[PDB]
Symmetry: C2
Subunit: 205 residues, 2 copies
Amino acid sequence: KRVALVGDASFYVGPSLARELARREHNLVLGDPAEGLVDELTALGVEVEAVLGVRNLADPESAQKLVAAAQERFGRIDSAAAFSGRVVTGKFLDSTLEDLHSVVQGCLEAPYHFLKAVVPVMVEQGDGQVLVMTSGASLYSSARAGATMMVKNVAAEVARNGVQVNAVGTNFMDFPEGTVEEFASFCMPFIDGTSKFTTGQFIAY
Amino acid sequence: AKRVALVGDASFYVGPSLARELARREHNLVLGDPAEGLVDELTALGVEVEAVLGVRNLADPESAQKLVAAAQERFGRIDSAAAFSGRVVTGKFLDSTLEDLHSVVQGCLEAPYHFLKAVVPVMVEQGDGQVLVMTSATAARPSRGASLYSSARAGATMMVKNVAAEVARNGVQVNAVGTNFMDFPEFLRASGANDPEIRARIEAAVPLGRLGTVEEFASFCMPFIDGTSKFTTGQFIAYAGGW
């Protein structure tokens, strides 16, 4: 019955979210799923909408496309999760303007466009749960802080409409080689409908 | 005057007063776009002054280098540098535009980056130097009315904090002063604060106040750039970083 939208189920972090959500009886709108997921899930009894070519949320069009798709197929968006990241490291004095532009695009523009597209739908619905997943590194640390602010401020604004907005951090990519399945299970409280009163938080797995 | 102090913008009233204080404290000066009467007023007290033209838009990648370059050619040294960064855009998130997110990022994030990227490497090669980032007014904790600006302003705080940490070892101290309770007009000019409907919207989301004159504010800034106090770094005072 409930509809869950996951921006990226290509690669590995997103698929596990889809599995835990499917167990919790949530129909799915998946962005660029890896093959054998649409099929696996449809067999498990959950309806699935594939939205293609929407991995770069910086593209104003991408998030718009994911939402349009969810609205046409299911007519509702109860949960939405999106991973926002661009990897840029280096001491400050060694960075480039391009590096700053890249972190802003990934950790500020990609969430911005996501929220600006999903939240209107949930505002009209009077309910909704949003989850922004964020990924020494002066510029990167800086964008995360902004994305953290962004999430807290937007939450304060749209709580009046019954919509939750929270953010989660992950240690993966510091070791590209616990599991993701445990991380998905941990994400579920923000998107499965069980807890609806937490908002504007940043938690670290 | 033997020490060199660089002032990113001396066009209005705050920077002139900084330069005037610094000159009493025997600094030579690198000024971006000095106010009318300033260069002459200053040379008549015996200071050397390098006026750098058309640089007071610091989000312009070329503006900071021009200032640093003039200093290197005319003085060979930059002991202190001060510069103000910040553009405020108000409005609810749902009614916003990427254009507004760009405006805040360029003013609050790119502008400090260019200044630090050009002045700090010099101070590193020198093993000594004091930086002062004067920050736009911090917004309120549940920053409704200014979601995007607060996001950029947070990101800029984190950036300056990180930089202060990196270069502390190389003898370069970097500090932030907030301008929330120092509401001289030039600070909010770029943010459209002429028409008082805009200004009312700014005031709704950021606490403002003016506690003193610009001459007093110069005096107040000297501890971070006048060379007499060289052990503090990474400080965010007067709400530059939050509450």
